[PDB]
Point group: D2
């Protein structure tokens, strides 16, 4: 019994197909709100998401402590562990702490690990092989590399990606680089599952052989994103591009506000208060919230 759709199925047994880098809810005073975290996770999954990245960029990994992370992880697992892949962001720009975070996540029962390219310090590609190498050797949990030079300062070059694909636990890439020329070949060569790490390219990556997405706007239009995926899967391409174009306003808003502020502001607008972000990240002001409502109504999610 097997029914092959049009979408590559590579690594979906570890990272799912349609998911989001979930926000980390905070109370009015900036404290982590575990209850709202479990609420949001169940909400999103019930909406169609089958994967959740906890402690990712959108999850505000820079302003949360290691304990807060582990806490959210264990809490969400108890909530939606039986029906969604839970991916833990454990990469930092310090190999030692990256290792610590990965071991803690493994013991917590994480289905996968998101390891961003070390940011700010700009290590050499040789440094990347040593960094990722150490992390992959610390646990048996599947790893999804996170390529995003726009935030980290350096990219994971093609040759480097090919070497890393040789490690037994490195099985996927969240791609926020958008180098379609290089990726088109790597997807075929490395055997790595490629996930869209940039909402405007969700449909684009599926067409090139992607396995799914790890979205931001998915917080505001989870059902739509699932539909984008299924549409492509079933060959209803016209439907896919209509949905993709439909959600454009959310992309524009993300561009003006940033993933964190947008995700938290959009959920609140839909009646799900998950607090505000921690400094230096900020919630949208009155004028920005007005522009956001506009985009959300145009996107058909408000």
């Amino acid at each position: 019994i097997t029914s092959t759709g049009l979408t590559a199925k590579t690594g979906v047994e570890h990272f799912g197909t349609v998911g989001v880098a979930m926000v980390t809810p905070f109370t009015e005073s900036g404290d982590i709100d575990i209850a709202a975290g479990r609420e949001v996770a169940a909400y999103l999954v019930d909406k169609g998401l089958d994967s959740l990245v906890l402690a990712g960029t959108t999850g505000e990994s820079p302003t949360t402590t290691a304990a807060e992370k582990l806490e959210l992880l264990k809490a969400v697992r108890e909530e939606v562990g039986d029906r969604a892949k839970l991916i833990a962001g454990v990469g930092t720009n310090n190999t030692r702490t990256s290792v610590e975070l990965a071991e803690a996540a493994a013991s917590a029962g994480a289905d996968g690990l998101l390891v961003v390219t070390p940011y700010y310090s700009k290590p050499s590609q040789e440094g990347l092989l040593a960094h990722f190498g150490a992390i992959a050797a610390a646990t048996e949990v599947p790893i999804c590399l996170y390529d995003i030079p726009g935030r980290s300062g350096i990219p994971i070059e093609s040759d480097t990606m090919r070497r890393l694909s040789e490690l037994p636990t490195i099985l996927a890439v969240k791609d926020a680089k958008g180098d379609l020329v290089a990726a088109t070949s790597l997807i075929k060569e490395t055997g790595l599952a490629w996930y869209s790490g940039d909402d405007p390219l969700n449909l684009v990556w599926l067409a090139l052989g992607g396995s799914g997405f790890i979205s931001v706007i998915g917080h505001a239009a989870p059902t739509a994103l699932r539909e984008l995926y299924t549409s492509f899967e079933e060959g209803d391409l016209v439907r896919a591009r209509e949905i993709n174009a439909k959600l454009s306003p959310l992309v524009a808003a993300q561009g003006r506000l940033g993933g964190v502020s947008l995700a938290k502001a959009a959920l609140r607008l839909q009646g799900i208060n998950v607090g505000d972000p921690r400094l230096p990240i900020m919630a949208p002001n009155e004028q920005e919230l007005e522009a956001l409502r506009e985009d959300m109504k145009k996107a058909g999610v408000l």
Copy 2:
């Protein structure tokens, strides 16, 4: 009687679906070779192309005279006019000469006009509206805007594109900019037919609602490109991405050699001598030709 496929059909009655910016063959001494031009055009069309851009970038518009252009145009029209859309490159960075070239092409019976964004001088967007405006008013021939900041120095901004889509003869865009965020919305808003102006994004543009391509590597793999299109059209997406990935080496070669040198060198390697380019453009040296043969054999076209 109508059978809707998955590909947008916008403007294909003027610019076709699968075509290439055809090379302008030169004899050993640098003179235009009309006979080889007609030979190549018939060859490409018989291979599956239903559109040809004459005097485009790949056609070496910078080193050919206005007379040589008109000549190739009239010659190709006599050869494949009854079965392919002929698009004439007429844009320059001088509004007066751009107008002159467009009128000459109209009288020659061109099915469409390719008008690149003025290069080098970097006019303002207001200047673009006046430039394109004058050209569109000079003839009744459908116009395809050519957006490629990488060669011209400036892009056709979104607002500017929306204004231009109001002119009755402006019906399409060759996109070599790759701003998927902006284009996803423009395609739906302006009603303009969008054509892939960058081979690695051919499949990507179809997924976003594109109408076809105006390729470079199409010179070396015309049948494959047609298949890429038909595959998408029929819903065979797996086939589409396999073909796309298959042709990657050609893209790499274009990246190392440039469209002109690659197109002319590749045809020669397949037994179709169309000469060398005119300075400052140069044919690949011995070492480069070796790397090219490699890519062509990997791409399955040699």
Copy 3:
């Protein structure tokens, strides 16, 4: 008898020290205005400029014919030939026409030749050596390479620059690339005279060993530019940076309007009407002219 100042004197006997890429005056109907051209040249030189580039970017080389160029050149030579170096822009993206333009300029008595990197077509560096090579072999007139990837699409790489510095007539570079790392070494290695091709870096280039400038804003503040040079030359650095900062508003305006529109609009505002530019280039509208007056008054030149 010799009094060494702080400024490098390399190649100033061919290209001068303080000059501008002069505009090409047009009458109300777009025709070349030779009289105003001679008027402006005498005006600028009397103001302190000792060099003039005719038919450069700012001189609207894309919209003027070869005859109009030769005409302006011969006219200005008759006007200020006995007291200013006249540099002729002869580079195009066609090696044949570039050669034609250089020979015509040589016969006209040009003191130097400005040869921009071929634009739009993006030739390989090998193509550049062949292109510049052919031009340098056609006449005995000193050549100043014009490096500006921002307009042409490609840069003159360092290794390429080193090879070209070996040709006996290649003696200078107008630098509009701003790669201070590479240039700092090339200036010392190649022995080429380096000229600032970007007003905000005029003072910066002198500090790194430059020989002078080929300005745009110099049209509006010729005396000031001369003073910037002399100040540095005499060691009055405080004065130099005060003048440099003082002229900043002009740079901002050039950034909003482009060199051509700015140069022609600024002269008109100072009582010297040199017409408007030719399409696609456009004069500033009413609102832009207001902002320009503001910048000019702040710069102290209105």
Copy 4:
């Protein structure tokens, strides 16, 4: 009694004139080596440096603990506190920890604070005002903003810089952005002391009104850097550009190796072992060390 040189003296009473972002020495096993830290600081200052940034990028702030930082700071202060300005890097991409680090540094007796633009998360400019605002309100220690979009992902926009210059403790900018157009005006407007944060622009910034540098290559050529400064100060510009060009190879090496690896590898080569960097940063391999020796000998420092 006052003798004005050519260099701006703004804020040098808090941040000095010639200094480096000092490395954080580690023993063979990766542990902090306080003794070598004090040795290097005394060495550099005796060589001519009058300022030292501790826990900066080059000081490997990403892989060292808060305690290790405070420790190095207190240790260096005891060593060279009576003759050099000690600047503490305290900025992170978490406002709370940035505040914690700044208070700890204040109590330690820091002469100034270096606060980098929050990296990776890409906050809005409004977020920057709130971030820097909170930090500046926590202590009375002079603050030097660190603008470097190349590492952080976002820049400190001009308007944002103008607002921040209003806070009483914000008195300087380490500039690693290189936007000479914007800075030329900000230096005059904001009254902020500008420091070169990129070695190839050290001389460039002095010419534009800079107050000094916070170098990387200064580890390998401290006396030369001091001479670069004094030369400019005394009006010996020819000497200044000869020194600047002379040190170019070090810049090239920094470009290939990165500041940390270069600084530590270069010191070792000069007989001062400060260990290797912590992962993901890596020391140069055998081949790289050979190329480095070459550059150092050419730079005249080996």
